[PDB]
A paper describes a structure:
EHBP1 was originally identified as an Eps15-homology domain-containing protein 1/2 (EHD1/2) interacting partner that plays a central role in GLUT4 transport and couples endocytic vesicles to the actin cytoskeleton. EHBP1 consists of an N-terminal C2 domain, a central CH, a C-terminal bMERB domain, and a CaaX box at the C-terminus that is a substrate for FTase4. In our previous work, we showed that EHBP1 is an effector molecule for Rab8 family members, including Rab10, and forms complexes with 1:1 stoichiometry. Our biochemical and structural data suggest that the interaction between the C-terminal bMERB domain and the central CH domain has a regulatory role in the function of EHBP1 and binding of Rab8 family members to the bMERB domain releases the CH domain, which can then interact with the actin cytoskeleton.
Subsequently, we investigated whether a mutation at the CH-binding site of the bMERB domain has any effect on Rab8 binding and could show that bMERB hydrophobic mutants still form stable complexes with Rab8a with similar affinity. Since we were not able to obtain wild type bMERB:Rab8a crystals, we attempted to crystallize these mutant:Rab8a complexes, finally succeeding with the mutants of the full-length bMERBM1116A:Rab8a and bMERBF1120A:Rab8a. We were able to solve the structures of the bMERBM1116A:Rab8a and bMERBF1120A:Rab8a complexes to resolutions of 1.914 Å and 2.0 Å, respectively, as described in materials and methods. The complex structures are quite similar, and we describe the bMERBM1116A:Rab8a structure in detail. Similar to previously reported bMERB:Rab complex structures, the major interactions between Rab8a and bMERBEHBP1 involve α-helix 3, and some additional interaction surface is provided by residues from α-helix 2. Hydrophobic side chains of Rab8a switch I (I41 and I43) and switch II (F70, I73, and Y77) are buried in a hydrophobic core of the interface formed by α-helices 2–3 (Y1149, L1156, L1160, L1179, L1182, and V1183). Several polar interactions were observed between Rab8a and the bMERB domain, including between side chains of T4Rab8a-E1200, Y5Rab8a-D1197, D44Rab8a-R1189, D44Rab8a-Y1149, Q60Rab8a-D1190, R69Rab8a-Q1176, Y77Rab8a-N1187, and the F45Rab8a backbone carbonyl forms a hydrogen bond with R1189 side chain. Taken together, our data suggest that the C-terminal hydrophobic patch is crucial for the Rab interaction, and the conserved arginine residue R1189 also contributes significantly to the binding affinity. In contrast, EHBP1 appears to have the intrinsic ability to be targeted to the membrane, and Rab8 only binds to the highly conserved C-terminal Rab-binding site of the bMERB domain, changing helix 3 conformation, and leading to release of auto-inhibition.
Residue numbers in the entry:
A (entry chain A): 4 to 174
B (entry chain C): 1074 to 1203
Write the structure that this text describes.
Amino acid sequence: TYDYLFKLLLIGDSGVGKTCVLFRFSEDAFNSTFISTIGIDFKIRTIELDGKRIKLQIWDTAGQERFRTITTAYYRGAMGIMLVYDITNEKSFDNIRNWIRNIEEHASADVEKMILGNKCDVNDKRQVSKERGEKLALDYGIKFMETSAKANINVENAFFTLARDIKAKMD
Amino acid sequence: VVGELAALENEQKQIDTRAALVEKRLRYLMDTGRNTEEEEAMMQEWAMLVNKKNALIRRMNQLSLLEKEHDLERRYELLNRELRAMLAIEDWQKTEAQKRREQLLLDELVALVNKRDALVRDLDAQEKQA
Ligand SMILES: Nc1nc2c(ncn2[C@@H]2O[C@H](COP(=O)(O)OP(=O)(O)NP(=O)(O)O)[C@@H](O)[C@H]2O)c(=O)[nH]1
Ligand SMILES: [Mg+2]
């Protein structure tokens, strides 16, 4: 009932919007309520990309410090990782290089990474400009997108680009 | 469709007991070489009854995996709401046994996600063989 299964992972600080980005992609809605993730979860959405059925198993990590030893066990065998920060929160953008060092110390060698600057609908609280998210990911050799789970900006584009980068690598 | 899956288990019992009543006949009509007319009629039934058994097993596989997936999701959704209520209580208010009770609840929650992940892993190995 599908062709291939891809394992995806969402990492970043608590409150950057990891669960909301996945809830926008897998169920086309947005929750305003901060419901912090406990430990680790995953969601399934099967897509139709380029004539082919692709189920995505997207793991959603808890960003709080007390769950970080649980979430480190799920890096190996991730085929794609989103590093999410909040464009309204300077410190979560600063913490992306800690999450870069958490990826390369635990994940696989060929894993395709992608930086998401989430909450790009909140212009009056923007602390990290769009040009600085573009230059950091170009420095890492990594694709960049500004997303908004609330405004449905580039969420479906982020997952369909990360599955296109997986499916081209099989070919 | 819980009443379907119990009906298909007795439908499977109707199929392979009819198939056991066919295979000894088709062996005896081939080894002794008795009737070529009822050998054509028994081979097209036994090829039908094996392919009807295979279609009934794989539909029973996809109903049993969906029933386990629904049960593990509602046990996950329940235990996550119990843990969210426990972790919202402060550290000093609960006893030391209640703090180690909520650690076991957290370990059981990671165990349920790994059980749900195992159903994904099992369905991946099933489709590449099918
Ligand atoms: N304006 C706006 N708010 C957003 C957006 N995405 C998430 N939020 C808000 O930010 C908060 C945190 O979202 P959440 O998805 O829980 O973040 P998280 O990274 O999963 N948190 P944790 O790691 O603790 O589980 C929520 O109140 C949510 O409504 C967005 O694109 N725009
Ligand atoms: Mg979350």
